[PDB]
Amino acid sequence: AEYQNIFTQVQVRGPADLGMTEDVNLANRSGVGPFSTLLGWFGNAQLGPIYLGSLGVLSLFSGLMWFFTIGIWFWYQAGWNPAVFLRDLFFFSLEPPAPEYGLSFAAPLKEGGLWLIASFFMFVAVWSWWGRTYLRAQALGMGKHTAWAFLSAIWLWMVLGFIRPILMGSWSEAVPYGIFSHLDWTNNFSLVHGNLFYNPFHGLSIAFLYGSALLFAMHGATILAVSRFGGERELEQIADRGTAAERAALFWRWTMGFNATMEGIHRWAIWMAVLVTLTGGIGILLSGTVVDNWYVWGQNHG
Amino acid sequence: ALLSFERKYRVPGGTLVGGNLFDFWVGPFYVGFFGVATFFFAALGIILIAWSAVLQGTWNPQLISVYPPALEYGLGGAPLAKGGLWQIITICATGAFVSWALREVEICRKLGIGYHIPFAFAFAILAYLTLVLFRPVMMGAWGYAFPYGIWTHLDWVSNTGYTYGNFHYNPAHMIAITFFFTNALALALHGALVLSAANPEKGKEMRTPDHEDTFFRDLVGYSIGTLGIHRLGLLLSLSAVFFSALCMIITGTIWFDQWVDWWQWWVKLPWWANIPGGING
Amino acid sequence: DLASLAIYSFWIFLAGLIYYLQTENMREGYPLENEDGTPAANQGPFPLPKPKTFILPHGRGTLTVPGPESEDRPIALARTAVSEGFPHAPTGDPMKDGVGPASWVARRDLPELDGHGHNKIKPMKAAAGFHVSAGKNPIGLPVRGCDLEIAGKVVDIWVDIPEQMARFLEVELKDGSTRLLPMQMVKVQSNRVHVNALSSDLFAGIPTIKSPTEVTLLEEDKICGYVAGGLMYAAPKRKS
Ligand code: BCL
Ligand code: BCL
Ligand code: BCL
Ligand SMILES: CC[C@H]1c2cc3[nH]c4c(c3C)C(=O)[C@H](C(=O)OC)c4c3nc(cc4[nH]c(cc(n2)[C@@H]1C)c(C(C)=O)c4C)[C@@H](C)[C@@H]3CCC(=O)OC/C=C(\C)CCC[C@H](C)CCC[C@H](C)CCCC(C)C
Ligand SMILES: CC[C@H]1c2cc3[nH]c4c(c3C)C(=O)[C@H](C(=O)OC)c4c3nc(cc4[nH]c(cc(n2)[C@@H]1C)c(C(C)=O)c4C)[C@@H](C)[C@@H]3CCC(=O)OC/C=C(\C)CCC[C@H](C)CCC[C@H](C)CCCC(C)C
Ligand SMILES: COC(C)(C)C(=O)C/C=C(\C)CC/C=C(\C)CC/C=C(\C)CCCC/C(C)=C/CC[C@H](C)CC/C=C(\C)CCC=C(C)C
Ligand SMILES: CCCCCCCCCCCC[N+](C)(C)[O-]
Ligand SMILES: CCCCCCCCCCCC[N+](C)(C)[O-]
Ligand SMILES: CCCCCCCCCCCC[N+](C)(C)[O-]
Ligand SMILES: CCCCCCCCCCCC[N+](C)(C)[O-]
Ligand SMILES: CCCCCCCCCCCC[N+](C)(C)[O-]
Ligand SMILES: CCCCCCCCCCCC[N+](C)(C)[O-]
Ligand SMILES: [Fe+3]
Ligand SMILES: [K+]
Ligand code: NA
């Protein structure tokens, strides 16, 4: 049975790695957390340290407040009965205001006002988390690729809960907070707009979502297949190409007639994934603002 | 033409079938016995689609569609224009896919690399075969398989899902989706991380993997590391396709009612089924 | 119609993105070459991108790509046919000559450095604070090759300091010298380390390193290529 490098055979540990310093404010870094031998069978064993400046505390505070606002509504719906809470957990739902309230904030607490409070908390949590992704890269002198990619996911989120409701004229267009209820909303959105399978941006979003699994399967398998030549040390393979990077390239050249580089495959990777939510957010934003029925639109445009 | 570094790798050997008979290249493409096989299977399958197009009537890619035999034919043969062309094309497609995978294995052996890539491709093949072979056979008719047409196979997705209500409620389908979304999240992060290290702020030196671990520890308190992230991408993507095949092989076989109703087994558990209040009480 | 303009704009953006991505992935290995090393006539429809320069840390210099490609080493292979596209036969011992699946690249003959400027990979005995933390400790185990004969004994683990993982096993041979074995090419068992890639008689030919406490990128490529080469070239000695 040849070894396949899926699970580590021998873990080694040394002094806890406190990380690179560059321009990072070291006062705002925690200490290192525990070591997880469990994780170490697959990835790194070390937990922490984490950086928690003011923006991080704000974002984590909003995020929990958003989560707690939903959960307090769930407890109310459960009649404060813990057995009811666990039984119906996926069935509870904190729903936005009804259409009559439009974009107003006048809706009663139990009739959309609580949804608006939870959503406000979510807005602050996500955008301040976005600033964290920019600032932690800046402190380390690194490119801003993570923050730009994150902005692509934020795009779809902003469209679903904020931009599209505003353009449609009411908060009732937004997604409710609940496991089953937001699935119902998703199915309903498609029926009300004449089947999203006719939305060309929805079909592109699927191509890139399938494509992301294809590509990460390809790339993840390729790196493991050349990890016997240090393949996963990708930054140094970029700086000084080794036989790992050459064999990886030639597997794909010989298979499909073209190939990537150790750097360029990460540009395919970032764009494949980023275009999922980029095209997806366009497809949603166009739905009901400009196109009421994708079936009808397709009869006239192709 | 060869990549500048390529000639040293183009040595004899590694074939699984045929010795040195097909051990050669056509431009960039390696051939081998399974390259010949792939070409044969894919050529005939495309020929039959070009043919099965006119027995249907058209030559537009958005309308050509090779439908399988109607359910009345069961698991038996069917006249060419009435579903037999679909059956032969499906055999060709399986032949082309499996031959492609085995040609990948030969390429792996010649390059001295591990077999991870064709192993991963085999998951996609098995998902394909679940929809066109394993599920129809368990349900008793090729007609449950999907048609080969750009827009018609979407029709089949919609018709099949809505046979069971909102297909969102299939629990294996929920797991499959979680892996698809998480995989795309992991792909964005991985691509962005390596690139942010290799392309730092202007005039700065390339960062190291140490900076990569540090960025993610600063961000979320953990870094899976450069080996682990590639294990992860492979595992998330294969897991998604595994649960995709799983969510379909069980649908219309062991579960055939509306998937939303499956979740009653939880609601009707003895110790809370009849407590008043909430949504289901 | 706004949607129809958006989808038309998008396909144009996507064509430009694919052009950019493909040209970005030509910063290595291009221009294409004939089997004799001269520039090939057909380069494809994509032109080489404008060069970029990577600034390497710790005074290691820079890398500008695309740039003049050269193998910087002799390649002991010869044609087996009178036309293009056929395999090239090793002119000597391909494991010793480093061709085929035994190939190596002339990477820099310096060790990779961590972010502080220290050697990334060190023998564990020289790595302060580092120890086996889980799994079977291989140090002390006999090493068995694919001929089912014992080729030596593990005397240390070479560890990646900044990433905290095992990268090589240091194996001592019958004559008292050691070799590095890639960690991804050995199977640690309860009573042995088994190495499918190499027969016992080929362990002596594993390329040696110059310094006992560090390994250079060039040395790692020669070690890893050699061991992987045995999968093809040691098959006459691989039992079962
Ligand atoms: C997987 C679950 C469902 C299904 C659900 C959906 C849904 C829902 C959608 C698609 C979409 C598409 N699917 Mg489908 N699809 C299925 C099975 C298949 C099979 C197959 C042999 O099993 C194939 C080849 C395709 C192919 C396709 C494309 C026409 C399109 C974009 C996919 C993509 O980029 O993926 C990622 C892969 C890549 C990026 C790599 C490149 C792949 C190329 C584009 C495949 C082209 C195939 C060609 C058109 C037909 C065969 C050509 C032969 C030479 C004869 N589907 C099954 C039945 N598929 C989308 C669309 O727009 O449809 C109109 C869409 O919205
Ligand atoms: C019956 C249901 C309808 C339908 C209705 C919809 C609707 C409605 C939508 C989609 C959308 C999508 N659909 Mg569809 N869809 C159907 C059929 C399919 C089929 C199929 C095989 O049949 C497939 C493969 C897909 C696939 C897809 C995706 C390509 C796309 C979502 C991308 C994504 O990553 O979102 C997941 C990613 C996000 C939501 C981004 C989230 C970003 C934020 C910032 C994260 C916040 C985190 C928060 C703070 C919580 C923190 C947690 C703790 C930290 C742990 N659909 C049918 C026709 N589909 C979306 C789209 O783009 O359509 C164009 C969409 O809105
Ligand atoms: C109205 C429709 C229903 C519904 C009904 C269905 C049905 C029905 C099915 C799915 C399936 C899936 N659905 Mg659903 N689905 C809905 C809503 C969604 C939403 C959403 C956001 O609402 C999402 C994200 C999903 C997600 C998914 C995935 C879990 C899965 C598709 C991927 C897959 O199977 O790949 C597996 C990959 C393949 C099959 C590809 C195989 C490729 C082969 C091996 C090679 C092709 C080579 C090619 C021919 C080469 C061409 C030449 C080259 C291009 C040169 N569904 C709604 C509720 N869904 C499908 C599934 O699980 O299938 C198993 C399925 O059948
Ligand atoms: C480009 C498309 C893909 C994408 C990209 C993407 N997402 C990103 C990024 C990128 C590039 C980031 O950089 C960023 C990140 O940091 O990732 C690590 C992020 C991220 N994407 C996330 C989620 C996410 N992404 C998704 C999807 C995608 N992300 C796309 C497929 C999805 C879905 C629905 O598919 C989700 C759910 C987060 C992990 C992170 C953004 C984090 C954020 O905004 O956080 C703000 C909230 C908080 C800081 C706190 C929230 C508190 C929690 C609700 C927990 C409550 C439980 C806790 C245990 C409470 C205790 C209670 C008990 C006592 C009961
Ligand atoms: C398992 C994880 C993901 C995965 C992995 C994966 N796919 C892979 C690999 C891997 C690891 C490869 O190595 C291999 C490859 O070479 O990629 C470049 C491949 C590949 N995955 C591909 C496609 C693909 N993968 C997909 C999905 C996935 N691939 C998963 C999400 C999808 C979809 C729909 O999600 C598609 C379309 C190809 C690019 C390639 C395999 C190419 C191949 O087999 O070539 C030989 C066959 C031909 C050249 C043509 C055969 C033609 C047929 C005889 C006739 C047509 C029949 C067909 C049923 C018609 C369908 C019509 C449609 C409109 C429905
Ligand atoms: C044990 O119980 C306790 C109390 C401990 C708990 O805490 C239990 C907690 C729970 C049970 C939590 C349960 C939470 C869920 C089930 C969450 C489910 C949420 C989803 C499935 C989200 C789906 C999509 C959500 C979207 C798309 C949100 C979009 C948000 C908007 C973009 C934000 C827009 C902002 C607005 C409208 C406010 C505008 C006002 C301004 C001032 C700007
Ligand atoms: C995404 C996984 C999140 C894991 C979070 C781990 C945080 C580690 C911080 C622990 C702090 C240790 N100490 C001693 C300072 O308390
Ligand atoms: C928050 C405390 C910070 C350091 C604690 C480290 C915990 C590591 C525990 C040893 C791991 C070995 N074990 C027993 C899990 O196998
Ligand atoms: C902390 C929340 C920040 C304000 C944004 C959301 C406004 C909440 C509106 C709730 C409505 C309350 N009231 C009295 C009108 O019923
Ligand atoms: C960065 C990777 C580029 C891959 C591009 C994939 C193109 C898939 C085309 C699917 C067609 C979708 N649609 C809506 C037109 O039907
Ligand atoms: C765009 C989705 C499907 C694309 C079809 C396959 C792309 C062709 C890539 C093969 C090119 C190999 N080539 C020409 C260099 O030899
Ligand atoms: C969507 C993925 C397919 C994109 C096709 C990319 C270009 C393939 C042809 C590259 C040519 C290789 N060549 C001959 C220049 O070496
Ligand atoms: Fe990578
Ligand atoms: K030590
Ligand atoms: Na050359």
Author numbering:
A (entry chain M): 1 to 302
B (entry chain L): 1 to 281
C (entry chain H): 11 to 250
Publication excerpt:
In this work crystallization techniques were selected, tested and optimized for the lipid mesophase crystallization of the Rhodobacter sphaeroides membrane pigment-protein complex, known as the photosynthetic reaction center (RC). In this work, the photosynthetic reaction center of the purple bacteria Rhodobacter (Rba.) sphaeroides was crystallized using various crystallization techniques. This transmembrane pigment-protein complex consists of three subunits L, M and H, and ten electron-transfer cofactors, including bacterio­chloro­phylls, bacteriopheophytins, ubi­quinones, non-heme iron ions and carotenoid sphero­idene. It should be noted that the RC of Rba. sphaeroides is one of the most well studied membrane complexes.
In order to have a ‘control and reference’ crystal structure without lipids we carried out RC crystallization by applying the detergent-based hanging-drop vapor-diffusion method utilizing conditions we used in earlier work.
